[PDB]
Amino acid sequence: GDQCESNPCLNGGSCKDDINSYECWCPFGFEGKNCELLE
Amino acid sequence: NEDEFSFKIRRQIEKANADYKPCSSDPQDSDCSCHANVLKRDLAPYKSTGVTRQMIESSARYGTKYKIYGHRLYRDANCMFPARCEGIEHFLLPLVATLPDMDLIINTRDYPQLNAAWGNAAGGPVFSFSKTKEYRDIMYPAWTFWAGGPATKLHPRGIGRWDQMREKLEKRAAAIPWSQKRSLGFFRGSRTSDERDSLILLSRRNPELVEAQYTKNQGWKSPKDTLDAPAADEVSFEDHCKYKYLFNFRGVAASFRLKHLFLCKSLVFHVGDEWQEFFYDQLKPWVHYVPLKSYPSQQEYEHILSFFKKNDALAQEIAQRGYDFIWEHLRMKDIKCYWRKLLKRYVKLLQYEVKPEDQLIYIGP
Numbered sequence: 405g406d407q408c409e410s411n412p413c414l415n416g417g418s419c420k421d422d423i424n425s426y427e428c429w430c431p432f433g434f435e436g437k438n439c440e441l442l443e
Numbered sequence: 444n445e446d447e448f449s450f451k452i453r454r455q456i457e458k459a460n461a462d463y464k465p466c467s468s469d470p471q472d473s474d475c476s477c478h479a480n481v482l483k484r485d486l487a488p489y490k491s492t493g494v495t496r497q498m499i500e501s502s503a504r505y506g507t508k509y510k511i512y513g514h515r516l517y518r519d520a521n522c523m524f525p526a527r528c529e530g531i532e533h534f535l536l537p538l539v540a541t542l543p544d545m546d547l548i549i550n551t552r553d554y555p556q557l558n559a560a561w562g563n564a565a566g567g568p569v570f571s572f573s574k575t576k577e578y579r580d581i582m583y584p585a586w587t588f589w590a591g592g593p594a595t596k597l598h599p600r601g602i603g604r605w606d607q608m609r610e611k612l613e614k615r616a617a618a619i620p621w622s623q624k625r626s627l628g629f630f631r632g633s634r635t636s637d638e639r640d641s642l643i644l645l646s647r648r649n650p651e652l653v654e655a656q657y658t659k660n661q662g663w664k665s666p667k668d669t670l671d672a673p674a675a676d677e678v679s680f681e682d683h684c685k686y687k688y689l690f691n692f693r694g695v696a697a698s699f700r701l702k703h704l705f706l707c708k709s710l711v712f713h714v715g716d717e718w719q720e721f722f723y724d725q726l727k728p729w730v731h732y733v734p735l736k737s738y739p740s741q742q743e744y745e746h747i748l749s750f751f752k753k754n755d756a757l758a759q760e761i762a763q764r765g766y767d768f769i770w771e772h773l774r775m776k777d778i779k780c781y782w783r784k785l786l787k788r789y790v791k792l793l794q795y796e797v798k799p800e801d802q803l804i805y806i807g808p
């Protein structure tokens with residue numbers, strides 16, 4: 405997978421590519437699939 | 444050598460500019476016809492047969508299901524990219540009050556989904572932001588015009604708010620007129636396509652001609668992803684405007700970089716003619732920008748930059764037309780009215796009755 409290339413994780417999050425989809429790791433203070441929500 | 448190159452380029456400019464016709468008879472474009480050709484071509488393959496319930500159910504797997512039913516917006520619960528759904532919803536929500544029922548499979552992934560070399564029950568319809576002639580996807584203005592573009596240090600919430608970006612870059616383009624801009628090729632970006640490599644390598648070999656460096660993106664796997672150089676800092680959109688010659692490249696699909704370059708009043712060198720957004724069709728090579736074929740060579744770069752450095756008035760005229768086109772024909776109003784015109788024409792293709800689906804969630808308004 406190459407979806408992380410386009411920087412889908414907001415607010416300082418880091419990204420890992422699966423084969424199907426991507427997943428964000430969100431810093432403390434943020435949540436959601438893209439770290440778009442305040443914690 | 445230099446003379447044959449010059450003749451070839453000037454010949455192309457004269458021909459492109461003699462053959463050019465505005466995208467609308469009146470510059471204010473009240474009937475939203477500027478980008479109308481693209482929406483007609485995208486929808487054309489469905490004109491005779493139309494769109495059946497089955498086609499939609501079959502296409503559902505390729506994107507997020509949106510449904511307008513009774514002037515209310517519904518959607519699959521799971522959006523793959525929530526920030527991109529929010530950006531799309533910014534434009535749909537105000538149109539829903541005055542729109543007939545319809546089902547929309549909106550792909551929020553970078554890459555399109557309906558390969559026409561497969562076809563295949565890759566018949567669609569599916570909406571995607573970017574495509575080439577290889578794909579049946581219908582283009583729509585990208586989420587990033589409001590929200591959910593790529594996230595960077597300078598734009599941690601995602602590149603968005605095109606309305607604010609337009610004012611920012613207008614002011615900055617006025618602050619740095621042509622004569623004050625540095626006479627260098629500029630690019631700052633990540634290695635989302637290897638078509639970008641030759642310009643970076645040329646910059647390492649000749650930094651007085653080209654200032655091009657690779658940043659690190661969220662998919663970074665190894666130092667090969669910056670061609671073994673330390674990652675460079677991000678440079679703001681506003682600071683692009685201190686350079687005369689701004690390069691744009693495809694990434695995974697089209698890049699949201701491009702539109703920003705024009706508003707610097709800098710000469711935009713657009714590499715490749717395959718990957719599209721909905722407005723690319725009316726950007727005409729040699730009128731609004733300098734086209735380069737894919738996988739440009741270092742020598743091509745050297746020749747083309749040398750030519751324009753020695754034909755500065757010409758450079759500025761194209762730059763000014765580029766700027767004018769985006770200022771006047773990629774307004775927010777153009778984004779909004781394209782969406783509206785697209786959905787109004789699409790709905791006429793439907794050959795079935797839209798029914799509620801209770802698993803969907805209510806979005807608004």
Ligand SMILES: O=c1ccn([C@@H]2O[C@H](COP(=O)(O)OP(=O)(O)O)[C@@H](O)[C@H]2O)c(=O)[nH]1
Pocket residue numbers: 410593595602631632633634635658660676677678679680692693694695697698699700701703
């Ligand atoms: O220093 C930079 C690097 C990137 N970008 C923008 O950030 C987005 C992501 O750029 P990148 O080159 O990483 O990916 P692309 O979308 O071009 O494939 C684009 O809109 C760029 O214009 C920017 O403004 N400054």
Ligand SMILES: *[C@@H]1O[C@H](CO)[C@@H](O)[C@H](O)[C@H]1O
Pocket residue numbers: 409410411552553593635693694695696697698699700
């Ligand atoms: C990263 O994603 C954005 C759109 O998702 C696009 O501009 C690029 O093509 C891709 O690299």
